[PDB]
């Protein structure tokens, strides 16, 4: 996260770290959506241009974390993966359309002060909150700059951007399964996701029921925190029918 700040303790208790076993390193962010299911970006697991194709046994999920590198004894919980599910129409060839994946844990994780699931939006909450100017919050342990790495989880709040501005900022083909967020050059403030933040959540706190909803997944961007560029996020609600299909079939 570029131009963010240190998270407060328990600020993002749905935050998940995807952790590579060997070599032991941060792979991606992710989010906890129930005691047995974790949501992330497909490109965190499958991206053939970079020879990335992880299997369940390659990875661990670390939940309840704050420090990036520490083993947070008596706080974090480490889970093994039972199964990975990637969206069947994930477009790794072109533009990361439908950049979404689910991971089922081998065993349920115990909730605590530091571990708690985020809500997924309904049609109404998405329609109400996914509006240009409305801010969400992005969290992760990714790079602090485009070209180092944080001690603890970082957070930044960013406004959703009008679709034509998103489209005009890039040569990549944008789809309805994406939205973009970030400040404009004239808006002064800044901030962005960066490499390592992939798969983490873009969340909004509903002013109607005071619950946090995951509206987006950190997907892609051209550089980090560049003027006139914006971060792109998987549109969770647009892909919710797939999420529900997978959980209903395999849950």
């Amino acid at each position: 996260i570029v131009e963010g700040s240190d998270a407060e303790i328990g600020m993002s208790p749905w935050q998940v770290m995807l952790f590579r076993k060997s070599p032991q390193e941060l792979l991606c962010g992710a989010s906890l959506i129930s005691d047995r299911w974790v949501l992330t970006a497909a490109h965190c697991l499958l991206y053939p241009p970079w020879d990335k194709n992880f299997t369940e046994n390659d990875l661990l999920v670390r939940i309840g974390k704050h420090s990036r590198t520490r083993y947070e004894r008596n706080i974090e919980k480490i889970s093994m993966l039972e199964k990975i599910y990637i969206h069947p129409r994930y477009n790794w060839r072109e533009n990361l359309d439908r950049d979404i994946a689910l991971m089922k844990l081998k065993k349920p994780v115990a909730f605590s002060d530091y571990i708690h699931p985020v809500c997924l939006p309904d049609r109404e909450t998405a329609a109400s909150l996914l509006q240009a100017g409305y801010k969400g919050r992005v969290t992760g342990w990714g790079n602090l700059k485009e070209t180092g790495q944080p001690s603890v989880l970082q957070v930044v709040n960013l406004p959703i951007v009008e679709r034509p501005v998103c489209k005009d900022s890039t040569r990549i083909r944008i789809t309805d399964n994406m939205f973009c967020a970030g400040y404009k050059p004239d808006e002064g403030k800044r901030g962005d996701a960066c490499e390592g933040d992939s798969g983490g959540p873009f969340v909004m706190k509903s002013p109607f029921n005071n619950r946090w909803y995951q509206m987006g997944i950190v997907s892609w961007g051209e550089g980090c925190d560049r003027d006139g560029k914006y971060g792109f996020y998987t549109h969770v609600f647009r892909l919710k029918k797939w999420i529900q299909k997978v959980i209903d079939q395999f849950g």
Binding site: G10, P117, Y134, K135, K205, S206, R211, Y213
Partner: peptide
């Protein structure tokens, strides 16, 4: 889950985090 999106150290104890107000102010 019925309890999703309510943080033990914040909403569950009626404490606010340092920047959630910025989000609320944007929801015009």
């Amino acid at each position: 889950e019925a309890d999703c999106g309510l943080r033990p150290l914040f909403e569950k104890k009626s404490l606010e985090d340092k920047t959630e107000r910025e989000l609320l102010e944007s929801y015009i």
